[PDB]
Ligand SMILES: *C(=O)O[C]1[C][C][C][C][C]C2=C1N(*)=N[N]2
Ligand code: NA
């Protein structure tokens with residue numbers, strides 16, 4: 190089934206077209222995913238020049254099918270079950286006391302490559318807030334992503350709070366509301382309530398002159 | 414209490430002297446540990462020219478006191494409880510269809526630095542096997558380290574299986590038997606059965622001419 194497509198290392202392509210407060214930008218990422226170890230490694234470039242938002246605000250938008258599900262929880266892995274045809278992932282991300290992102294993404298195999306293609310629209314951001322003011326630290330906390338089935342849509346929902354460290358010591362909260370639905374008509378696994386535990390390390394490539402992000406991520410399912 | 418020594422970041426020194434089938438070597442490592450996040454960052458160099466075994470085979474030998482124990486599991490953290498006087502860590506590592514490593518290490522504070530000082534002896538290795546023939550991939554899988562109390566020694570025991578990917582697509586198993594005993598006479602915490610979930614990334618420094626390994630590790634306790 191879909192899980193068989195993830196037994197080894199899978200190439201990943203990420204494409205994002207964004208508009209935040211009228212600032213239009215694009216990001217391209219390339220790397221690999223190793224779901225057996227729940228591991229992602231990717232490098233992202235802003236292909237339009239300077240990114241108009243902080244890189245950390247785009248991490249969650251920029252492939253949960255790479256999560257490591259323990260053997261006893263494999264029947265709850267919706268993400269792999271939807272492959273290779275894939276799924277649509279939609280979110281609203283509400284930054285507390287600031288703007289909102291709305292995103293729609295399709296995650297699917299194109300041959301041997303797992304592709305995540307995303308449209309993002311951001312509105313109502315404060316000009317000198319933490320986002321457009323670039324006041325967020327270049328780091329990423331560990332989170333729990335809470336997943337529940339959405340039987341009526343043959344999919345899932347998720348809700349979680351991202352904590353972005355601010356340079357002044359405060360924390361910028363980003364509330365995430367997520368829904369995923371299969372692209373194909375084949376059967377998928379609808380899960381019992383559980384969560385994904387995430388760990389992320391953001392870095393730079395010292396030889397890279399373009400605006401970019403190097404990302405390492407480990408993600409593991411738990412709670413059943 | 415020993416756990417208080419591990420707030421923030423702590424410098425780490427690792428020193429290993431090894432002899433495998435008569436091939437002698439030394440390794441020195443330096444870096445830092447952040448127990449609050451279960452995170453380790455280290456760089457190791459062979460100070461005796463070419464390392465005669467693959468770097469991945471030494472990862473487990475080259476500081477479980479840096480593991481993140483969740484708040485509900487803090488009474489099960491033997492490793493920190495033994496600090497600053499430290500503990501002895503001894504292992505037998507049996508490579509399937511190949512030789513054995515015998516290790517003895519002392520892990521303790523020396524001033525501000527957490528030091529792991531190790532002696533390693535390897536015997537019965539095949540000259541053209543996966544180890545002495547350098548047939549192992551430069552990578553590392555995620556593992557669970559199963560821990561139980563060893564009340565008879567006022568310590569702990571652990572057992573786990575390391576899976577080393579081989580260049581021909583096979584997996585080289587390394588069975589690990591471990592015992593740890595406190596160096597000092599103060600009280601320690603003896604745990605209920607649990608495990609450490611380990612995640613490791615190996616890399617190279619492009620400008621480093623010595624034989625070396627850069628390691629990033631996340632370790633979290635679980636199972637209770
Ligand atoms: C962070 O990596 O979490 C750990 C162990 C705690 C629960 C998540 C299970 C998991 C990890 N590593 N692999 N799976
Ligand atoms: Na603006």
Ligand code: NA
Nearest residue numbers: 287318319320
């Ligand atoms: Na703000």
Ligand code: NA
Nearest residue numbers: 355359360361
């Ligand atoms: Na703030």
Ligand code: NA
Nearest residue numbers: 392403405616
């Ligand atoms: Na990197």
Ligand code: NA
Nearest residue numbers: 477479480632
């Ligand atoms: Na550790």
Ligand code: NA
Nearest residue numbers: 550552578579
């Ligand atoms: Na491999």
